[PDB]
Amino acid sequence: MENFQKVEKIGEGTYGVVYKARNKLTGEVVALKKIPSTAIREISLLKELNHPNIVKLLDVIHTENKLYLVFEFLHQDLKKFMDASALTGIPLPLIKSYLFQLLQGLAFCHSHRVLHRDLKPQNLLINTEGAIKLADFGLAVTLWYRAPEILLGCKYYSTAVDIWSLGCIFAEMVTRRALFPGDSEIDQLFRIFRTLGTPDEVVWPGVTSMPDYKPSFPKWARQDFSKVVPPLDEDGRSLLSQMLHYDPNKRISAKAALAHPFFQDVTKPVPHLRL
Numbered sequence: 001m002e003n004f005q006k007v008e009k010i011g012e013g014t015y016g017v018v019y020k021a022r023n024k025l026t027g028e029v030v031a032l033k034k035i036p037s038t039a040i041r042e043i044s045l046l047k048e049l050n051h052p053n054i055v056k057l058l059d060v061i062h063t064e065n066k067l068y069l070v071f072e073f074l075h076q077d078l079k080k081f082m083d084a085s086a087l088t089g090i091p092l093p094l095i096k097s098y099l100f101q102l103l104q105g106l107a108f109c110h111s112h113r114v115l116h117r118d119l120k121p122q123n124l125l126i127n128t129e130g131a132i133k134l135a136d137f138g139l140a141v142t143l144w145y146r147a148p149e150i151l152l153g154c155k156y157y158s159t160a161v162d163i164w165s166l167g168c169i170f171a172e173m174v175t176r177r178a179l180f181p182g183d184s185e186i187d188q189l190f191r192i193f194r195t196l197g198t199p200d201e202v203v204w205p206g207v208t209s210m211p212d213y214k215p216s217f218p219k220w221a222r223q224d225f226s227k228v229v230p231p232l233d234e235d236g237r238s239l240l241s242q243m244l245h246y247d248p249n250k251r252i253s254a255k256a257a258l259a260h261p262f263f264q265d266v267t268k269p270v271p272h273l274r275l
């Protein structure tokens with residue numbers, strides 16, 4: 001890790017801090033993430049997990065209590081791009097491209113039993129050629145993308161959690177505002193309830209016996225879905241509702257979502273990026 005000149009800090013969670021960096025000898029520009037035997041073996045496995053819509057993990061560096069992951073560098077994240085596009089909106093065909101590629105990335109990881117668990121716009125990275133890629137997964141303060149079953153204390157949650165988060169991202173790209181911007185776990189859960197309606201045994205068998213479920217939860221009626229994402233067309237809306245099903249078992253898989261009618265006319269536009 002003397003092999004790398006830090007250029008700038010580009011990110012941080014509590015996992016670690018991410019820098020754009022330059023290899024002193026090869027000149028390559030990379031993203032360097034500065035972060036237990038179990039974790040070493042696990043991240044070794046993730047290194048083999050190559051797909052066009054997953055940020056490539058090039059190298060793992062374990063040096064004295066400290067662990068660095070060396071990633072390929074992409075040039076902008078989706079949040080910054082959504083903000084830059086905020087007056088105009090991202091054109092539907094590019095929204096659809098990005099949602100489609102993200103679903104290919106999920107299906108691939110999911111087929112390997114690898115989950116993201118913490119998807120958000122800052123983990124979705126774009127380039128000038130119209131690709132979008134997922135960063136930070138298998139690695140497992142923003143609750144906004146969190147699936148209802150995590151919030152209800154489920155211990156053994158599934159690949160469905162990433163479909164939920166990706167559904168909330170889709171809605172946000174379309175409306176140019178976050179769908180569920182909670183500022184606490186309960187606020188997050190109650191904002192979900194107030195839009196989609198308070199879940200019960202009819203729509204989510206077993207929900208009322210989940211660890212943090214309370215009979216005292218207010219009982220809100222579900223809102224009209226056309227009020228949630230105007231002006232998504234009805235195909236996008238149907239796909240969105242399948243991604244935001246309460247019951248993780250009813251919630252559409254990445255693989256099934258790829259086949260949804262919404263993607264019948266999918267293409268790959270290039271975005272206009274200001275770097």
Ligand SMILES: C[C@H](CO)Nc1nc(Nc2ccc(S(N)(=O)=O)cc2)ncc1Br
Nearest residue numbers: 011018031071073074075076077080135
């Ligand atoms: C920090 C980000 C998500 O953890 N990780 C990466 N980010 C990038 N690039 C990056 C991230 C953010 C931005 S920003 N915030 O200017 O759009 C620009 C480039 N590249 C590879 C990785 Br891994």
